[PDB]
Symmetry: D2
Subunit: 347 residues, 4 copies
């Protein structure tokens, strides 16, 4: 089968011909009908998340098929599979754990000590087929097509979790940094659907802000032409933002936004652009500010976002559908900040 | 009345004689019997918390009587005061708000936009009497004496809230930095009394660690004669600490402990030594760690620590007492890191 | 000034002429522009909530002006009032506490031991003016008019708190009983605005269900012409409802819905029709279901619903307005179940 | 192997000779060194929990080996078992789920739609060996012996969860009904270890109250000689109890304690004596009281209580150790309210 794999860092993904997995036990073989392209793949290709080398520090073993936004039809199931039949259209939660470690026992499976992340350390969706370790990570689709559902397995579940960590309510204001991109449009839609908080979207491209508005942002700020700090201060009437979901965490964003937080404000750090957070400690203490890391999501988060989308409350903004072989072009678009919403590959 | 006030930044507190406040409405006048000495007064005297100037930046108007750990007896009450009488022994919650702003409405009074902090921007306990804006901030003392209860109004409520933010449970390990001081000894007693988590106390003086051990720490580590990272990793079997309550937040502590956090670990920042937190962002994201600021406490926190104390489940470790006029010496001891537990003035 | 007061239990509210309150300190005098009519006033007039007598049991002292959904303009302020001026349009939180008791300290003012409930044990909005104990209970109106905001101070805050207690999320289903009334229409709008859960509205009148559908219900069920159990089970695919907000709690509703709860399901009891909950204990234990009482709301709840409303995300459905003197007729409509949405007096 | 099984309701458990299970895959065969006796087995033997027949209504299929308080040594592991070796002394969490249903996905495994409860609908610990479905339900013991740990898997995890649902803090008072029994002594120790709340123990036997005190109760009330209502009112100075953990839920207890709740008080219903809760609805609404059901516990709860005990913070009060063949006598003792603390069988 065809597969776009990461064979060497700093080099484009290579199309290869590898065997189709054979499911056994509780595993499930899925024929891919949609594979979303995540900016995280830009970092993977470069082989690094900030100062962290995926191979040397994170333990990734090359080669590996990328693609962690997965949706397709069940092709074959193992002998222990129950409640799923061949032909079923499903979305797949790639953030899988083994079950015995501390993090799996408390329901934080994505933080497993021996993680099975499809598309990162295990073969992902940039292929004609993908082997899913356990059927419990599936979610049958009815209202959504594979193309519309795929982005939900990463950008969706990730921002759903981040939005929960933001602890929103009607009296609070949320600021999303990078609001026109893949996770940005998803975070905005979700915040608009599961809370009554005021949503402010921030980006640097005119097209990105149009995307943020289509996503439902109550207010948008172009940080290239406008003074983001002044605008956020004005909109919140001098109070500052009660929560900020930073989908960049770059030298640029971390030098600006951590300073527009209201007292008790929560700065949820999702982006992986790579930079150090330098912040005066007394500022953290005296203002009870919080810097919170958020990574993908657990089974509850996956269930939550899938339920919301399947109910028609939110829907990924897929702006382009391309071939599996165009994987390197889709990733380039993100690397060059030329895409809005989400791009999805179809084998 | 006698009163030790911050009259000039950088200079010792000055013994001054000012009018005795006259309570009206729901206000209450307390005759001070005990005033705890907090390290915060070292910063105050120096005129800053890190880069933040108390006057220009934090808006403190001098002169002001310091002292934010308050306990004494009611001397006089306003005409609207209910449920309290002259002579009543009480502890005072100094972190007061006005009630109308966003923060007061959600029950986070200490973060009021127009704060009324006794001992900070309003006159405190380093005097014969102290005026209390509302009787709602009082707590009748029964089991504890004024001297034993005074520290609860700051070191107690501050660490009670911090322990709460640490989200502890029996399977977690908590590390307390500065475990032998005023807040350190309280943080440990509270953590042991309101959770079943493993407690590791870290300090840099043999006696401080002994005070930490007595407070109830399961393990103690002297960072100045042994590598804390190795011990903490060993104790947690390589997992790291699920929570750290840093009562320093100095360049020294922030360069060590943030790196010993377990995944989802919470770094609660209470200390105000002054330094910049510096941490690689990808590490915060990939490990889902949290850096959380915690400041004094609200009325719920005050009630929690006073009830816990009056029930005899925790008790401030007062290692020495002295006169009001000796305020400058007590503060020097903290500045020179010469004390263990809490000092109280009378 | 004119005022409709509960002078005699069992008898209509009486038009009376009493002195106009004079505000002092932090008190504020509001000139009433809108007073919502709540079903609670049906109980009040009848003199009881279930078996609980408002006088003997609940301690209500007659006579008292009713009306707990308040909105109007500031007429006069006490000398200590800050941030408000004469002429300011505001909504009033009537569920007020004194601040010193356990409940006020933990931020649950509405459960104060010495409650100051405007329209219940203190004079309410069914009059030309109403005295407000503290300006902290006010909320400046910008987007909404007095008539549109009045209902938020009871039907809004009550259901906002109830929606919160329901612990909803996208994978859950909420069932609202009495979905076409004052609280019902609000509960649905709020549930839709602050969660992504599936909402099922149940009522017994075609128009009530239409009002429920308009409020935003995903499904509507007329319990008087179809079996609600079958529909709810079908809609939830046999799982049952994860939460039910019962705005009746009558022998009729309690004999049906508690049995349609999913495991861990939460039955939030708001309605005060009067009945006894009767459920086999082993079922509560084995299914981990919860029967939760919810009463009006605290300052945090008030802030939440007022902000949500002023942002235009929800809005009380006022289907009719009338004169203060018509108070007894508006209450009759609710008693006879003749209204949909909310009625407001001017 | 020997096994004490429930073969017919209303009749004593029968000693039988059944084959020793053969573990495969992720299963683990444990040689039982301790099996605690739970009052729940009194209800099982009678074949009913209140109005609920275990067979006709709950779906239990007879015969079945009882015993849900399990501890022993690993005898054999399946091929997929990792991190566990033969000879390891472990406690076993019997409240197991399948993983795919809603409740398993959100971390509430014990409420699984297709539960695997060892000792209830699957063979339990009243035997020489027990087959554990998955090694992730194990917890290695170091400080505790099997006899001291066994009770933790039901009375321990159940009361740990109930204590959490009670939402305690230093200013609150907890009242435990049935404080001298198995779950009673465990609830008291736990509340004393994980909260600073005031603990009041209530029972009807002098011996039961001695047990409650040894457990650490701050106050004890003998409901046979004293007026429980008056005492609770006096101790809480007229406020009432902020939380009540009822380990009976009988006609007797439900007619008394739901009426001594403080405003916002939580009545956590754990006991299964069988009775209907009849309570005036306006009382629930106007006082914001809560009636909360609590059943065993999930993997997080199990991890929590095991950590606490393994740390020496709490320890089951085993008052008697007897032979496997004495299973019917141990259960009779509970049925007749003649035992304090917990009884443990050793094959
Ligand atoms: N923590 C997690 O679980 C997780 C999961 C997925 C992706 N991510 C990370 O989130 C980040 C964004 O991912 P994405 O897929 O949405 O990519 P994306 O390219 O679609 O979005 C990036 C957006 O950032 C905007 N941007 C660039 N510089 C900016 C600035 N200075 N201020 C404001 N906006 C700016 C761009 O215009 C663009 O719209 C990446 O680093 C990715 O690896 C994290
Ligand atoms: N955020 C708040 O609400 C709040 C409230 C009160 C006090 N504080 C602050 O907390 C800090 C401590 O206050 P305190 O009253 O307990 O004072 P303290 O004098 O008791 O000092 C705390 C302890 O820190 C120890 N220490 C010093 N260097 C150390 C190192 N490198 N590693 C480990 N331990 C070290 C000292 O030996 C001492 O025992 C101060 O900065 C104070 O201003 C904050
Ligand atoms: N706990 C609190 O804080 C609080 C606050 C305000 C009002 N309330 C109470 O809530 C209840 C409802 O108040 P409301 O103002 O919305 O009044 P309402 O007149 O609008 O009545 C509510 C709805 O119940 C419907 N109904 C009647 N019988 C029904 C049945 N068998 N099944 C389904 N629906 C049925 C009616 O048709 C009506 O639409 C009252 O008992 C009131 O006193 C409680
Ligand atoms: N929900 C769950 O997860 C769960 C789990 C295990 C056991 N249980 C149930 O909890 C209950 C108790 O179990 P146990 O194992 O501790 O049994 P136990 O016999 O050891 O305890 C019962 C105690 O109740 C006391 N008691 C009897 N009548 C009383 C009264 N009127 N007032 C106060 N105390 C009274 C007895 O003196 C005795 O000490 C049973 O119904 C059992 O099935 C529930
Ligand atoms: Zn794991
Ligand atoms: Zn304020
Ligand atoms: Zn009160
Ligand atoms: Zn399941």
């Amino acid at each position: 089968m065809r597969a776009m794999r990461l064979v060497e860092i700093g080099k484009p993904l290579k199309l290869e011909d590898i065997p189709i997995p054979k499911p056994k036990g509780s595993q499930v073989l899925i024929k891919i009908e949609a594979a979303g392209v995540c900016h995280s793949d830009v970092h993977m290709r470069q082989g690094r998340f900030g100062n962290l080398r995926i191979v040397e520090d994170l333990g990734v073993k090359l080669p590996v098929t990328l693609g962690h936004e997965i949706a397709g039809r069940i092709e074959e199931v193992g002998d222990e599979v129950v409640g799923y039949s061949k032909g079923d259209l499903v979305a797949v939660n790639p953030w899988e754990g083994e079950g015995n470690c501390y993090y799996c026992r408390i329901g934080e499976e994505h933080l497993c000590d021996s993680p099975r992340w499809l598309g990162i350390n295990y073969d992902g969706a940039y292929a004609e087929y993908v082997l899913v370790p356990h059927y419990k990570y599936l979610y049958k689709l009815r209202r959504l097509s594979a193309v519309e559902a795929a982005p939900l397995t990463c950008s969706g579940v990730t921002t759903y979790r981040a939005v929960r960590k933001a602890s929103l309510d009607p009296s609070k204001t949320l600021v999303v940094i990078g609001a026109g991109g893949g996770l940005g449009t998803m975070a905005i839609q979700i915040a608009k659907a599961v809370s009554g908080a005021t949503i402010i979207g921030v980006d640097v491209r005119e097209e990105a802000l149009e995307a943020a508005k289509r996503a439902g942002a109550d207010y948008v700020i172009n940080a290239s032409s406008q003074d983001p700090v002044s605008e956020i201060r004005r909109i919140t009437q001098g109070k500052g933002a009660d929560a900020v979901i930073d989908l960049n965490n770059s030298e640029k964003t971390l030098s600006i936004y951590p300073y527009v937080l209201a007292k008790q404000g929560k700065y949820v750090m999702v982006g992986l652009f790579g930079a150090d957070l330098k912040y005066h400690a007394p500022l953290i203490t005296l203002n009870e500010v919080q810097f919170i890391g958020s990574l993908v999501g657990n089974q509850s988060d996956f269930l939550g976002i899938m339920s919301l989308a399947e109910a028609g409350k939110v829907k990924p903004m897929v702006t382009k559908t391309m071939k599996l072989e165009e994987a390197n072009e889709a990733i380039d678009n993100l690397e060059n900040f030329k895409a809005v919403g989400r791009q999805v590959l179809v084998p």
